[PDB]
């Protein structure tokens, strides 16, 4: 469960990210595709060329969902309900890949938040991203 | 992944009794029932709407034959699984776009199917040998991803 | 979440296990130690060889916890609360190992219950075992 | 494993800029903060009661530096990680009883620590090369388990 301290940490860190969220979402996707090439098996329909607008657009969608999850941190199952339906019934990404994207999101945050990415904030962000992932895979079967 | 001589013997002994066609269909069917998101790769196979629709689906069963045929062939080359599965690895990456995590899932489902068919004969040591095999096959099928 | 059919399936299968629950728990543990040697790191103080009184006793504990979970299938987070406290604060087993034991429990059940271990029942049992594992790792951080 | 010549060069260049005291203490400290159950292996280190206590703990800092020392040996022998880490693998299994899944956790914390220090310099390609490295180290450290 996300503690009050976790929620404070996540809200502060994502607040600092602010309007950079979409850019960071794209960067996290690019990091994931390069670092964990098996994740590209979910995007054979994408243009994956360097600086791909399609990847950037996707990064924005991922980031905006995360922004929403932060805004609704007390009730993520409800806030993410439509998205979790889509993941379970259409996208059907194997659960292991959520940990890969989550790690790449942490790396991206670490690379952009030198002051903010303390050990405690790192821990809270990791819990938050794992919780989002749990919600997104909750209806798989 | 290195089997002992006795493990190799046990794997080969058990496999001689396997109906590889039947077992392949059953393993692939159970994959699609137990982990239904894996149906994403088989939309063309028709009705996958219930456990029976999946298990008895003739296209699932026919495909399971291919899969287990290739697995059966790999059992003859336990010391060179990466080489054995290289062209299939490239195919599953470049043409089929299959996340290799699926190979790990299928291997464990296959182990369950072997236990179901063989009962007490699928002893803990025999299982341990087969776990080395399915881990090696999954790792081999993943190896040429890029 | 476990569906009505999942709960019917789990109750029927585990009920058929019946008096064998402890035997099958110990067999699952043995299968795990042989198949996945890294799981032995958690038992340096045990004889892990075949016929081990320690493995038999532990198998009985594991099986009895599963029987209690089946009895309280709609309240597992609370029924397993003390056990989850022990896991989070003492045992501290990495979550991957729960998947290994769960798989070994499925293999054991498959090997003993030819008629009962249908594809639908297998699916329900896997979900049930994953749900128990989730409860047992829920308080780690 | 499979570092390309250009990734080998990139890994070596970045590592030549790494402060081992800082990066080692931060990586081990963050393992213990982010995944607090791993503290089970480090009770003798004394006070691990808060993140500040962990990060400032002299034994955590010293040990993190030692761990990075072994990592440096790996980076100097990328074509034989299994041989490089054989003795340490045996130690971690036989004497320390450390589940190798923990090696993956440490590898990814190390990557986060490199990103945190280097910022934009820790580019996506550089990260990809380091992911191969940490995966290779974890796999080598796991290799002599039995
Ligand atoms: C033991 C592991 C596996 C082996 C040995 C194996 C082997 C094969 C073989 C021999 C083919 C035929 C290749 C061709 O068409 O040229 C094939 C096709 C295919 N496999 Fe795999 N396979 C394995 C696991 C999986 C898994 C787990 C999945 C996904 C859940 C998968 C998805 C596919 C798909 C989608 C095709 C093409 C099906 C079609 O023609 O519509 N495979 N596999
Ligand atoms: C994956 C990269 C790792 C490397 C390269 C590494 C390396 C080392 C080295 C060089 C030592 C000192 C060995 C000696 O005493 O001669 C050591 C000790 C130790 N390591 Fe590892 N380690 C790694 C990961 C881990 C992890 C993830 C854990 C636990 C979560 C761990 C637990 C320990 C423990 C408990 C000791 C003994 C500490 C003591 O003296 O009390 N190691 N390691
Ligand atoms: C490695 C694969 C993968 C992972 C782990 C993943 C993890 C996540 C996470 C977790 C933090 C979030 C918040 C997220 C959010 C989104 N993803 Ni993800 N996605 C992934 C692969 C996809 C794919 C594929 C699509 C479809 C994209 C397209 O345009 O076809 C997708 C679609 C989306 C959409 C658009 C839905 C719609 O059309 O309404 C959102 C939002 N997502 N994805
Ligand atoms: C691979 C490691 C491992 C896994 C995956 C695991 C998975 C599970 C699962 C999951 C289905 C269940 C229901 C379960 C139940 C139990 N475990 Ni587990 N345990 C594990 C390693 C332990 C260890 C270690 C102990 C202590 C044993 C001892 O006697 O020292 C333990 C002790 C217990 C006890 C006894 C607690 C007490 O003393 O009150 C129960 C009951 N368990 N364990």
UniProtKB/Swiss-Prot annotation, chains A, C:
Chain positions with Phosphothreonine modification: 8, 108, 134, 137
Effect of residue 48 to R: In Montgomery
Reported impact of residue 114 to L: In Nouakchott
Result of changing residue 44 to R: In Kawachi; O(2) affinity up
Binding locations of heme b: 87
Positions of post-translational Phosphotyrosine modification: 24
Resulting phenotype, residue 141 to L: In Legnano; O(2) affinity up
GO molecular function, one term: iron ion binding
Residues binding O2: 58
Effect annotated for changing residue 6 to G: In Swan River
Effect of residue 97 to K: In Dallas; O(2) affinity up
Resulting phenotype, residue 78 to K: In Stanleyville-2
Phenotype for residue 92 to W: In Cemenelum; O(2) affinity up
Tissue distribution of the protein: Red blood cells.
Effect of residue 27 to G: In Fort Worth
Gene Ontology cellular component annotations, sorted alphabetically: blood microparticle; cytosol; endocytic vesicle lumen; extracellular exosome; extracellular region; extracellular space; haptoglobin-hemoglobin complex; hemoglobin complex
InterPro entries attached to this UniProt entry: Globin, Globin-like_sf, Globin/Proto, Hemoglobin_a-typ, Hemoglobin_oxygen_transport, Hemoglobin_pi
Keywords: Acetylation, Disease variant, Glycation, Glycoprotein, Heme, Hereditary hemolytic anemia, Iron, Metal-binding, Oxygen transport, Phosphoprotein, Transport
Disease implicated: Heinz body anemias: Form of non-spherocytic hemolytic anemia of Dacie type 1. After splenectomy, which has little benefit, basophilic inclusions called Heinz bodies are demonstrable in the erythrocytes. Before splenectomy, diffuse or punctate basophilia may be evident. Most of these cases are probably instances of hemoglobinopathy. The hemoglobin demonstrates heat lability. Heinz bodies are observed also with the Ivemark syndrome (asplenia with cardiovascular anomalies) and with glutathione peroxidase deficiency.
Protein's recorded name: Hemoglobin subunit alpha
UniProtKB/Swiss-Prot annotation, chains B, D:
Modified residues (N6-acetyllysine): 59, 82, 144
Record note on what altering residue 73 to Y does: In Vancouver; O(2) affinity down
Documented effect of changing residue 67 to A: In Sydney; unstable
Effect of residue 87 to I: In Quebec-Chori
UniProt effect for mutating residue 97 to P: In Nagoya; O(2) affinity up; unstable
UniProt-reported outcome of changing residue 75 to P: In Atlanta; unstable
Impact when changing residue 37 to R: In Rothschild; O(2) affinity down
GO cellular component: blood microparticle; cytosol; endocytic vesicle lumen; extracellular exosome; extracellular region; extracellular space; ficolin-1-rich granule lumen; haptoglobin-hemoglobin complex
Effect of residue 70 to D: In Seattle; O(2) affinity down; unstable
Result when mutating residue 48 to P: In Bab-Saadoum; slightly unstable
Effect in UniProt of substituting residue 23 to D: In Strasbourg; O(2) affinity up
Name assigned to this protein: Hemoglobin subunit beta
High-level lineage: Eukaryota, Metazoa, Chordata, Craniata, Vertebrata
